[PDB]
Structures are given as C-alpha cells and as structure tokens.
Design a protein around this ligand. Structure first.
Ligand SMILES: CN(C)c1ccc(CNn2cnnc2)cc1
Length: 284
C-alpha cells in the first residue's frame, strides 16, 4: 500500500508531516491534521494548496488528493474556511484559538484591514493570551514585540499595544482570545474572501464571499450586497460567473447577474466557494 508524504503549514507557522495512501481523499489528510491539532469543531476549517497557476485552492475532502494537486507538490496549509459570525457560540476554546491564529495572519497579510486602534487592541489581547500580565522588565521605552501585529509596524503601534496590554492584568488566555474575536468579528472585511472580476461592462470590481452573502465592491461609493436567501442559483460558464437573484415581491421574473473572471479556473473556484458558503450559512 503506497503512501505519499504530506507537508501541512499550521496556523502557528510550524510544519506537520504525515503519510497517506496515494489514492486518499482529502478528508483522510484533514482528519490526521485535526487530530494532531486536538480540534473537534473541524467544520469551520480546511486545507488549501497552491495550483499550477499558483492560486490558493481548497482541498476537496470528498475527492482524491492526487486529482487535485495533480502535477504539484503534496504541500498544504491549514486554514479557516468558514469564519463563524459569532465566535462566542463555538463550543471549544481551542477552536477560538485557531480562529485567532488565522485572523492574526489575515491582519498581518493585509487581507483584513484594521484601524490603528483596532490593530493595537487586537495586538494587546494576543500579547495578554501569549505572555500573560504586563511585565515592565520585558519592555523599556524602546520595546518592540516579537509578535507581528500589522501589515506595517511603527513604534507608535508598539507603544499602543503596551499601553492596552497594561489594562488587561489578570485576563486568562481564553478570555483574551474571546475579546480578540469580539473585536475582529466586527471589522467590515471579517471572513470576506475577495475575488477579482469585471462586471458586464468590463469595469474591474471585487466579489466578496462571506457568511451573510455575496458582496460587490464597485468603487468606494456603491457596494452591492446579496444576502444568501436572495440567491437561488450560482453558475459558471467559460470565464463567466452568474448568480440567479430571487424575484422581489410582486416581480414576475428572477434576475441573472453576470461577471467576467480572469480564466475558467477562477470562475469555477468562485462558483465552488459561493455554493459552499450558501450551504454553510443555510445550516446556521
Ligand atoms: C455539513 N457541514 C457541517 C460540513 C461542511 C463542510 C465539511 C467539510 N470539512 N472539511 C474537510 N476538509 N476540509 C473541509 C463537512 C461538513
């Protein structure tokens, strides 16, 4: 029984290595990673890989790993797939912990834009969780933390993290992680998966996929949003992605809205994430 070596980047940046049988479905690897992580609330998470065109793709747990990674390395990342809109309702602290690690990388990467004060507050909870109570011994007026907090670090931001960290004395890790999540969940790009597209006129937009629905980001002014209940069918054809919007009250006809994606693979990818997010949110 021939086995392939898998390397998984975990959310703390460490590498987990394991072997699966070469005809294994994605679920087999995912189960091994989740057992390694002592993660029970596995439904929110998934594995990604980097494809032939080097995009991020979700590893389909129901399909053979080899028919997905195809010519590529058996190298994966462990990620949040479905961002819980209310993380306080998760059953385990360890689930909230992994969601915090993902969100830290969402922030440092610039996928999750954040004001100065929110960056500092999120940072202060992370430090409280990781090091415990503020210690002046490990921080002079020139202190710079080992923690990555933001896409661009400043001395100002480091100072503000420390000032807020002082206020959290006696906060336990689970408590600080819950406060981190209570702030993060409110950010306008929380759990929003952004896809580059063009509208039916060739104008560059972004489509955002999230719990509440599909978002369009035309230009600063005019952000369209389609709550999942308003979406009856999602489809793709060639480089095009279509959503069938439910008929408004007293309207005779459903309405179809069309987008141009960079290529066929990008249209299929957007279709699949939309279908998955509609099902997820429908079972909330
Ligand atoms: C019906 N719900 C609760 C549901 C949703 C997604 C999955 C797949 N989970 N997974 C495995 N590998 N990546 C993601 C399982 C169940």
């Amino acid at each position: 029984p021939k086995s392939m070596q898998c390397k998984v980047i975990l959310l703390d940046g460490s590498e987990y290595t394991c072997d699966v049988e070469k005809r294994s479905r994605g679920q087999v690897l995912f189960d091994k990673v989740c057992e390694h992580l002592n993660l029970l609330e596995k439904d929110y998470f998934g594995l990604t890989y980097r494809d032939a065109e080097n995009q991020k793709n979700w590893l389909d747990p129901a399909k053979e790993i080899k028919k997905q990674v195809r010519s590529g390395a058996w190298h994966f990342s462990f990620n949040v797939k479905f961002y819980p809109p209310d993380p306080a309702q998760l059953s385990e602290d360890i689930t909230r912990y992994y969601l915090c690690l993902q969100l830290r990388d969402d922030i440092v990467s610039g996928r999750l834009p954040c004001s100065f004060v929110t960056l500092a507050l999120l940072g202060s909870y992370t430090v409280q969780s990781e090091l415990g109570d503020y210690d002046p011994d490990e921080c002079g007026s020139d202190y710079i933390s080992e923690f990555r907090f933001a896409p661009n670090h400043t001395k100002e931001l480091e100072d503000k993290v420390i000032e807020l960290h002082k206020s959290h004395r006696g906060m336990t890790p689970a408590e600080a992680e819950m406060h981190f999540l209570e702030n993060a969940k409110k950010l306008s790009m929380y759990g929003v998966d952004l896809h580059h597209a063009k509208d039916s006129e060739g104008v560059e937009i972004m489509l955002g996929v999230c719990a509440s629905g599909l978002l369009i980001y035309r230009d600063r002014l005019r952000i369209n949003r389609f709550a999942w209940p308003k979406v009856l069918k999602i489809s793709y054809k060639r480089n095009n992605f279509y959503i069938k919007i439910r008929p408004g009250e007293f309207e005779q006809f459903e309405s179809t809205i069309g987008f141009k994606l960079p290529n066929h693979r990008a249209a299929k990818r957007l279709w699949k994430v939309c279908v998955e997010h509609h099902t997820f949110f429908r079972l909330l």
